[PDB]
Scaffold this active site. Structure first.
Site, short mmCIF file in Angstrom:
data_model
loop_
_atom_site.label_atom_id
_atom_site.label_comp_id
_atom_site.label_asym_id
_atom_site.label_seq_id
_atom_site.Cartn_x
_atom_site.Cartn_y
_atom_site.Cartn_z
N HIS A 43 7.03 1.07 -7.72
CA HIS A 43 8.45 1.05 -7.47
C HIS A 43 8.86 0.03 -6.41
O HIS A 43 10.06 -0.10 -6.16
CB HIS A 43 9.00 2.44 -7.12
CG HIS A 43 8.57 2.99 -5.80
ND1 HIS A 43 7.52 3.88 -5.67
CD2 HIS A 43 9.08 2.84 -4.55
CE1 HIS A 43 7.40 4.24 -4.40
NE2 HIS A 43 8.32 3.61 -3.70
N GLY A 148 9.45 4.24 4.10
CA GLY A 148 8.55 3.11 4.34
C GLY A 148 7.07 3.43 4.28
O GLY A 148 6.24 2.51 4.41
N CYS A 150 5.37 4.62 1.66
CA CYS A 150 4.74 4.51 0.35
C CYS A 150 3.67 3.43 0.35
O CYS A 150 3.80 2.39 1.00
CB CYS A 150 5.79 4.22 -0.71
SG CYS A 150 6.74 5.71 -1.04
#
Ligand SMILES: *[C@H](O)[C@H](C[C@@H]1CCNC1=O)NC(=O)[C@H](CC(C)C)NC(=O)OC[C@@H]1CCC(=O)N1CCc1ccccc1
Lengths: 306, 306
Positions: A43, A148, A150
């Site tokens: 993503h 932040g 991920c």
């Protein structure tokens, strides 16, 4: 009396040397640089105002190698040139022109419910903390992750070999977390889309409760041990009706049984009684069952056996 | 009225060209040859006399490259020289001196409960049959495997890419089967040792029962549909009490709801009622719920949608 148990993580230095920042379009997150590959959540390709229903196949088609900016900030900084890009499930696999000179010996593995692993929480490609979690029976973890995070990674270690098992993707409505394995599958039935998702029921991890009761015995706390016994088969029938995972014994549990002289079946009986209430007593400072310590944790931390 | 549903496997030709025979001492089974690697179950290293509690670490150290004999029998026969060996979980990774010239585009992935995959059953490195199974909630499959079948592979296919998900290892007491993913983990809590293992309870796969009820409606069989609805939340509480998996809807199920005009929640209500009895009635020739067809099967086989 303190149990001698803590939430113990692996030392993180080897994994720190593999963390990078990946930026695509309007998004940035963390990636893992191993050999000539950088892994990160797919993503990163999604415009922030489309995370609810992305078409990841089309997004990938729309990218070129130059669409991805990969930076190592830790240690010796570097900017890594991307020379190939591919999607595997919910992860991107970015090929870079330089092999990470600090790549550790490693494998990819999937973690199972009740198993513990270490997480290196990172932001903007910079490690900020480490903690350990158990994979819950509903394929979430009770983590600590902010915007932040991920691409932060989870791993176990066998000898010097790092077994990477988790890459962080999302936070669920109940505050728990989930992510991908490095085969690109999401854990459980989750999807990497920004929509509310069905959450399965959590359960007590029976193997880990047994380990904790053994830790209590190893600390001289055994008021809950009686001659009474419940067979594994009978316990597992009971577990299905009472929010517990089915018990599957292991060599690690067996070692605790031999060291203490207390049979597994005595502790299965004890669990059935304790689930109806501790009746005013405590076990290792708790008035509720604890399932966040594994048999391996107890063997290692109390007996020094790996 | 025949539903138009059959157990549909992928065409097996691409995977047939990857099967080999692996022999170590007097033990033999099948392996999967991709690029310069042959994957096979590690218990090929174990003398038949020691399968109950093998020391696989010691067995691996005792082996040399010359300990392994790898043959391709189908197509153009070949004897493949092993030039490196290593163990990953419950699999061996043997490096051979020749790259498989028929290596398809491929990945490794894990399959989840309720998902279907195709199996190529092999003996002595020779493919003999193909069938499809759904991974059960207790991480077994209802397969058809005899002595010598280990190393038979299961896979899904997306476009021209083969996603390998299963390598056969063992039969359980109740006649079902399990194996490894290609990260070397066994599915479920199973171990690759010749000893009795706890078998977890199986469950009905709700998402697949829903698919099958949609297949019935598509075929004109909808007597069980009422205005009544059960929400996903309420159904999942009921499922835990009734030996069903919790329902998690997908885009594939949603397409069936649109095509038939029947809401998921109407079928969740129907399932609750049908589970107490069909009342002498039949659905698609059956007096019991069917959970061996996925939403994708129904979309593909009845509507032609892949
Ligand atoms: C590999 O080719 C072979 C495939 C098996 C053979 C029969 N059908 C199959 O699918 N696998 C093995 O031989 C296994 C090797 C292990 C992983 C080291 N063993 C295996 O499958 O054993 C099955 C037998 C019969 C059913 C059963 O429970 N067991 C295990 C031994 C056992 C323990 C307790 C009670 C009864 C039997």
């Amino acid at each position: 009396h303190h149990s001698g148990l803590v939430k113990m993580s692996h030392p993180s230095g080897d994994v720190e040397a593999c963390m990078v920042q990946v930026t695509c379009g309007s998004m940035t997150l963390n990636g893992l640089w191993l050999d000539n590959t950088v892994w990160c959540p797919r993503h990163v390709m999604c415009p922030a105002d489309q995370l609810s229903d992305p078409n990841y196949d089309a997004l990938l088609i729309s990218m070129t190698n130059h669409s991805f900016s990969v930076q190592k900030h830790i240690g010796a900084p570097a900017n890594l040139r991307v020379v190939g890009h591919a999607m595997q499930g919910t992860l991107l696999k970015l090929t870079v022109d330089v092999a990470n000179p600090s790549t550790p010996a490693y494998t990819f593995t999937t973690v199972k419910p009740g198993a513990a692993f270490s997480v290196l929480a990172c932001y903007n490609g910079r490690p900020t903390g480490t903690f350990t979690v158990v994979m819950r029976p509903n394929y979430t973890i009770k983590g600590s992750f902010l915007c932040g995070s991920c691409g932060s990674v989870g791993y176990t270690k066998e000898g010097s070999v790092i077994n990477f098992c988790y890459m962080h993707q999302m936070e669920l409505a109940n505050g728990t977390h989930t992510g991908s394995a490095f085969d690109g599958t999401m854990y459980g039935a989750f999807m990497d889309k920004q929509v509310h998702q069905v959450q399965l029921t959590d359960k007590y991890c029976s193997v880990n409760v047994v380990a904790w009761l053994y830790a209590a015995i190893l600390n001289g706390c055994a008021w809950f041990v009686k001659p009474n016994r419940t067979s594994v088969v009978s316990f597992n029938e009971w577990a299905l009706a009472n929010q517990f995972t089915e018990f599957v014994g292991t060599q690690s549990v067996d070692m605790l049984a031999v060291k203490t002289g207390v049979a597994i079946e005595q502790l299965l009986y004890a669990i059935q009684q304790l689930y109806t209430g501790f009746q005013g007593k405590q076990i290792l400072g708790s008035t509720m069952l604890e399932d966040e310590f594994t048999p391996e944790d107890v063997n290692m931390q109390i007996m020094g056996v790996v």
